[PDB]
Amino acid sequence: ENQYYGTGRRKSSAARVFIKPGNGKIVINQRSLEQYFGRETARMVVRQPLELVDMVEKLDLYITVKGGGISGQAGAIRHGITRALMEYDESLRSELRKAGFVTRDARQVERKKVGLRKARRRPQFSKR
Amino acid sequence: AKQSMKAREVKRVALADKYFAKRAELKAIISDVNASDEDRWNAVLKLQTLPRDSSPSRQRNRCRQTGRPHGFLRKFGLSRIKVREAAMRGEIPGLKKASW
Amino acid sequence: GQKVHPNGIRLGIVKPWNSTWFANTKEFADNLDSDFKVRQYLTKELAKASVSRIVIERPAKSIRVTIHTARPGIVIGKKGEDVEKLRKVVADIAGVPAQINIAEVRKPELDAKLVADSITSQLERRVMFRRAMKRAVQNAMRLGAKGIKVEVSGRLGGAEIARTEWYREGRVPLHTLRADIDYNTSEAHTTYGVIGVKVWIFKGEILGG
Amino acid sequence: ERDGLFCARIFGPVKDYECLCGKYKRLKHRGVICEKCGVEVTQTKVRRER
Amino acid sequence: QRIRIRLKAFDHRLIDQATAEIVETAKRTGAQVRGPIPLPTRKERFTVLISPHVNKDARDQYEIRTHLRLVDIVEPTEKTVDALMRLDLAAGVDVQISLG
RNA sequence: AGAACCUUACCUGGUCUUGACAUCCACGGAAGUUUUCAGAGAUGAGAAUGUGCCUUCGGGAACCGUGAGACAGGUGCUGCAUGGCUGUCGUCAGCUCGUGUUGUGAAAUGUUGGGUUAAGUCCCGCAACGAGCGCAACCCUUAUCCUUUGUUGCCAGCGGUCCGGCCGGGAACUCAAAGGAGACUGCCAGUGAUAAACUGGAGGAAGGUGGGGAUGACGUCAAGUCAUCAUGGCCCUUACGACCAGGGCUACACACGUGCUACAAUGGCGCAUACAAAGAGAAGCGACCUCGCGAGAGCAAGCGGACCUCAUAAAGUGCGUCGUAGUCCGGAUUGGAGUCUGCAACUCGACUCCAUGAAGUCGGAAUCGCUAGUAAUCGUGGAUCAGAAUGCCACGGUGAAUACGU
RNA sequence: UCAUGUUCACAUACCAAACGGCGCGCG
Ligand SMILES: [Mg+2]
Ligand SMILES: [Mg+2]
Ligand SMILES: [Mg+2]
Ligand SMILES: [Mg+2]
Ligand SMILES: [Mg+2]
Ligand SMILES: [Mg+2]
Ligand SMILES: [Mg+2]
Ligand SMILES: [Mg+2]
Ligand SMILES: [Mg+2]
Ligand SMILES: [Mg+2]
Ligand SMILES: [Mg+2]
Ligand SMILES: [Mg+2]
Ligand SMILES: [Mg+2]
Ligand SMILES: [Mg+2]
Ligand SMILES: [Mg+2]
Ligand SMILES: [Mg+2]
Ligand SMILES: [Mg+2]
Ligand SMILES: [Mg+2]
Ligand SMILES: [Mg+2]
Ligand SMILES: [Mg+2]
Ligand SMILES: [Mg+2]
Ligand SMILES: [Mg+2]
Ligand SMILES: [Mg+2]
Ligand SMILES: [Mg+2]
Ligand SMILES: [Mg+2]
Ligand SMILES: [Mg+2]
Ligand SMILES: [Mg+2]
Ligand SMILES: [Mg+2]
Ligand SMILES: [Mg+2]
Ligand SMILES: [Mg+2]
Ligand SMILES: [Mg+2]
Ligand SMILES: [Mg+2]
Ligand SMILES: [Mg+2]
Ligand SMILES: [Mg+2]
Ligand SMILES: [Mg+2]
Ligand SMILES: [Mg+2]
Ligand SMILES: [Mg+2]
Ligand SMILES: [Mg+2]
Ligand SMILES: [Mg+2]
Ligand SMILES: [Mg+2]
Ligand SMILES: [Mg+2]
Ligand SMILES: [Mg+2]
Ligand SMILES: [Mg+2]
Ligand SMILES: [Mg+2]
Ligand SMILES: [Mg+2]
Ligand SMILES: [Mg+2]
Ligand SMILES: [Mg+2]
Ligand SMILES: [Mg+2]
Ligand SMILES: [Mg+2]
Ligand SMILES: [Mg+2]
Ligand SMILES: [Mg+2]
Ligand SMILES: [Mg+2]
Ligand SMILES: [Mg+2]
Ligand SMILES: [Mg+2]
Ligand SMILES: [Zn+2]
């Protein structure tokens, strides 16, 4: 049909979401949503935007996602879906933004710093 | 480093360069599973005979300027202090301070 | 309060590299060593010829040296006798065909390395350190440096206690990365020991990159 | 074109006192023979002699 | 029978200049160069101790960045191959012409 | 950023004395080669092969040998003689100068005062007017977009299919770099001295320095380093120099610092199964296949690499088991067998297999880190390196609690 | 509710156009 696209991204994930009208189908890397994310939080987050903007029983989605792990990937997919929805309607910006899905979450990982055991944990200190 | 230490290093390098073909041959004989026991034994003894500084594992990497046997970097051939001096002066091409 | 080296903090941005060649890790250390050799030889030979910057650039298994110098006439000699001699020695040291070029430093009162050398020479031949340093600053400002700082350090005037003294004139914005700060050092080997000379010369503020 | 009727390493260098392969351009090198192309660095005047 | 050219440089501006030059040579000499594709840069990082002796946390992190450019030219002609051979590039950029 | 030998600087014994490392002469010899006996080796005696590159050729330069000394040599002492480099207060917001004015003067003022700020930040005032070094910005990285280009990277839509982006292809998307755009209290309302600012909101990927780095003012501590280096003075010079083999730096009544692993069920074990990032690689990374319980071995593609290799992420998820036991927790310790690197693993390597199965049940007084993709927890890589990390330096996965207030 | 801190030592100072036919013309 029309095929409305959106690139999602979060921590190191990068989703490619292709919205298409139809049934409420989700296919993530040639796998069912439940198959790919065998996790409730992840499933919830990828569904979330559709539930907000009542199109759950309304759209196919062909996804491909690379990089990061389960939670990051789910977040990326969510971002992509929202972007795609905006492309498709463009009236939804207000609801989606209010929800807080349009924002690209820019938190990545603080690099390890010389002197420090981690990004911020300093080694144990002593006076004597 | 001392002059003597530097000289020792050069001597070791020269010996290694000299005896490479022979040592390799002897080692191959010793390793070779398809080979005679007496021959292998002879090879092991011959290798012992060869000078110790022919062994590459005898030679320590030292700063090519100061001779410092620690803080070495293979890409530059220089110990950390000299690497830093060169880098700051711009003597090492492409190298600059890194941030990310 | 140890300060970052102004050249090394500015490479890439406003400042170029002296050596400019590519090499893989196979040839990299060797190339660096060869450069060190060539630079050492050249400095030893041309100490009297005032030499500001040797710039080595090797393409295609051949070395191209570029000597930035206050007195070309003295580096070149008559009919290029000394340049030719130098070229051949450089070639032997490198192990490749050599090519020497000579860049003429018009204002060596603004060239930091040259200034440092002059101050050190004066110190060695027992001039008054303070006087030499003041003269250096005045001369650079007169020639039109946007600013200059000079620092000398250690056993000044044969004093038992070492101390460092410095004069600044104009602006010398060290923390400004886009500031064209020329910097260099030298060492005066006096009868009482080493005396360190550092010189910063703020030419102006480059905006292109 | 090298080994043709003008080859600078057969007869001699074209430039006044400097070599063709570019490796040497100063009287200090006078009489060295390069190993990029093989020319002798010498008086270009002798290009008419040999 | 297309000619592949790999450009490697520590400075990126120089690599761009070289690649553009190669492209110009190809396009002028009548050839179908595919495009100057930027391959990834290698950020080779080094970390050295700044003090000449103790103080471990005082350190400098340097890095050399090697930039890549792949330029392929489809259909090597006479003029094209010879032009490529003749053209010598900037010193600070290593070129590698692999024919296939 | 890595002590078996080396490193190595220390000890023991064995040795050398213009010398291991340079220049300089003298004169005898091409370098180098190949083996032999004695020796722990350093070496000391031999036996063979070559006896050459270039000369106007009275020989030279490359390179040994011997003798003379001038000298070399010193990781010997002084970091309180020094350069250079570094820590530190402290990434704290401060520290000064010129001219003027005030004071006999040391000095003051500027640089305080009213607000404000992360900021001596900014505005207003004001015997100050200006300026400098700092703050901020300029730099790198990360978060959004756009243009360009498309292999070794990509596969939306097309046909083919061994259902593998694999092959025709496509240039859309991810991504790869290069160049642009973007964030400035710019817009809105209020508070405010007609202010600087502050409080909220609008849009926006991002909001008030957006997150993170680099960047460290004048100076302080006679702080650290003469053992990176350099260096003044002093000292040794048949020895505080040089060569060698073996040992030591790994000792062990004990005391402390920093870590790792645990004490378990939010867990151990078994079987299946998902999702990374960033790196390295030619005296290198090493696939496939075969052998080995395994560490590994044999053969042997590839590949200076978006191509090939290292290289299977682990925590997770599902099913089972164990059922609160010093245990199917814990792995120290020790015995036996091996593998690999290496002339060589006794002192003193790493790893594997089989056995063993300590202490330890959440730790006294006290004390440390951390404010967000942080802490906690999980793996991965790199330097050094023949071999030898629980350290260091990097990378991603999951991912909190709390901040009333001074 | 909070006691104590050995001795001596502080530096700086007036690189400049080239070779052959065919012609016409001058002498
Ligand atoms: Mg599919
Ligand atoms: Mg401490
Ligand atoms: Mg020395
Ligand atoms: Mg070693
Ligand atoms: Mg200092
Ligand atoms: Mg610093
Ligand atoms: Mg030892
Ligand atoms: Mg001596
Ligand atoms: Mg010494
Ligand atoms: Mg000494
Ligand atoms: Mg000190
Ligand atoms: Mg010092
Ligand atoms: Mg001390
Ligand atoms: Mg003293
Ligand atoms: Mg005043
Ligand atoms: Mg103040
Ligand atoms: Mg004051
Ligand atoms: Mg105030
Ligand atoms: Mg200010
Ligand atoms: Mg004021
Ligand atoms: Mg700043
Ligand atoms: Mg970003
Ligand atoms: Mg497709
Ligand atoms: Mg909003
Ligand atoms: Mg807002
Ligand atoms: Mg002290
Ligand atoms: Mg000394
Ligand atoms: Mg010492
Ligand atoms: Mg000694
Ligand atoms: Mg020993
Ligand atoms: Mg030992
Ligand atoms: Mg030790
Ligand atoms: Mg303690
Ligand atoms: Mg502990
Ligand atoms: Mg632990
Ligand atoms: Mg167990
Ligand atoms: Mg465990
Ligand atoms: Mg098997
Ligand atoms: Mg690579
Ligand atoms: Mg690995
Ligand atoms: Mg599990
Ligand atoms: Mg279980
Ligand atoms: Mg017990
Ligand atoms: Mg229990
Ligand atoms: Mg506990
Ligand atoms: Mg904080
Ligand atoms: Mg870890
Ligand atoms: Mg390591
Ligand atoms: Mg290793
Ligand atoms: Mg460490
Ligand atoms: Mg982490
Ligand atoms: Mg008392
Ligand atoms: Mg007292
Ligand atoms: Mg006294
Ligand atoms: Zn030449």
UniProtKB/TrEMBL annotation, chain A:
InterPro entries assigned: Ribosomal_Su5_D2-typ_SF, Ribosomal_uS9, Ribosomal_uS9_bac/plastid, Ribosomal_uS9_CS, Ribsml_uS5_D2-typ_fold_subgr
Annotated Gene Ontology cellular component terms: cytosolic small ribosomal subunit
Entry keyword set: Ribonucleoprotein, Ribosomal protein
Entry's Gene Ontology BP terms: ribosomal small subunit assembly; translation
GO terms, molecular function: RNA binding; structural constituent of ribosome
UniProt keyword annotation of rRNA-binding present: no
Oxidoreductase is among the record's keywords: no
SUPFAM superfamilies found in the cross-reference section: Ribosomal protein S5 domain 2-like (SSF54211)
A Pfam cross-reference name: Ribosomal_S9
Family: Belongs to the universal ribosomal protein uS9 family.
Full protein name: Small ribosomal subunit protein uS9
Automatic annotation (TrEMBL), chain B:
Keywords, sorted A to Z: Ribonucleoprotein, Ribosomal protein, RNA-binding, rRNA-binding
InterPro entries attached to this UniProt entry: Ribosomal_uS14, Ribosomal_uS14_bac/plastid, Ribosomal_uS14_CS
Example GO biological process: ribosomal small subunit assembly
One GO cellular component term: cytosolic small ribosomal subunit
Example of a GO MF term: structural constituent of ribosome
Subunit details: Part of the 30S ribosomal subunit. Contacts proteins S3 and S10.
Function: Binds 16S rRNA, required for the assembly of 30S particles and may also be responsible for determining the conformation of the 16S rRNA at the A site.
UniProt xrefs under PANTHER family: 30S RIBOSOMAL PROTEIN S14, SMALL RIBOSOMAL SUBUNIT PROTEIN US14M
Family of the protein in this entry: Belongs to the universal ribosomal protein uS14 family.
Name this polypeptide is given: Small ribosomal subunit protein uS14
TrEMBL record, chain C:
Any single GO BP term: ribosomal small subunit assembly
The keyword Ribosomal protein is annotated on this UniProt entry: yes
Keyword match Protease: no
GO cellular component: cytosolic small ribosomal subunit
Coiled coil segments of this chain: none
PROSITE patterns referenced in this protein's UniProt entry, alphabetically: KH_TYPE_2 (PS50823), RIBOSOMAL_S3 (PS00548)
Recorded superkingdom: Bacteria
GO molecular function: mRNA binding; rRNA binding; structural constituent of ribosome
Record InterPro entries: KH_dom (IPR004087), KH_dom-like_a/b (IPR015946), KH_dom_type_2 (IPR004044), KH_sf_prok-type (IPR009019), Ribosomal_S3_C_sf (IPR036419), Ribosomal_uS3 (IPR057258), Ribosomal_uS3_bac-typ (IPR005704), Ribosomal_uS3_C (IPR001351)
KH type-2 domain segment(s): 38-106
Sorted UniProt keywords: Ribonucleoprotein, Ribosomal protein, RNA-binding, rRNA-binding
Xref: HAMAP family: Ribosomal_uS3_B
The family this protein is said to belong to: Belongs to the universal ribosomal protein uS3 family.
Subunit structure: Part of the 30S ribosomal subunit. Forms a tight complex with proteins S10 and S14.
Task of the protein: Binds the lower part of the 30S subunit head. Binds mRNA in the 70S ribosome, positioning it for translation.
Listed name of the protein: Small ribosomal subunit protein uS3
Source organism of the structure: Escherichia coli
Upper taxonomic lineage: Bacteria, Pseudomonadati, Pseudomonadota, Gammaproteobacteria, Enterobacterales
Automatic annotation (TrEMBL), chain E:
InterPro entries from the UniProt entry: Ribosomal_uS10, Ribosomal_uS10_CS, Ribosomal_uS10_dom, Ribosomal_uS10_dom_sf
Pfam families, alphabetized: Ribosomal_S10
Small ribosomal subunit protein uS10 domain residues: 4-98
MF term (GO), any: tRNA binding
Keyword Ribonucleoprotein part of the UniProt annotation: yes
Keywords: Ribonucleoprotein, Ribosomal protein
Keyword tRNA processing set for record: no
GO biological process: ribosomal small subunit assembly; translation
CC per GO annotation: cytosolic small ribosomal subunit
Family: Belongs to the universal ribosomal protein uS10 family.
Assembly description: Part of the 30S ribosomal subunit.
Protein role: Involved in the binding of tRNA to the ribosomes.
Name the UniProt record assigns to this protein: Small ribosomal subunit protein uS10
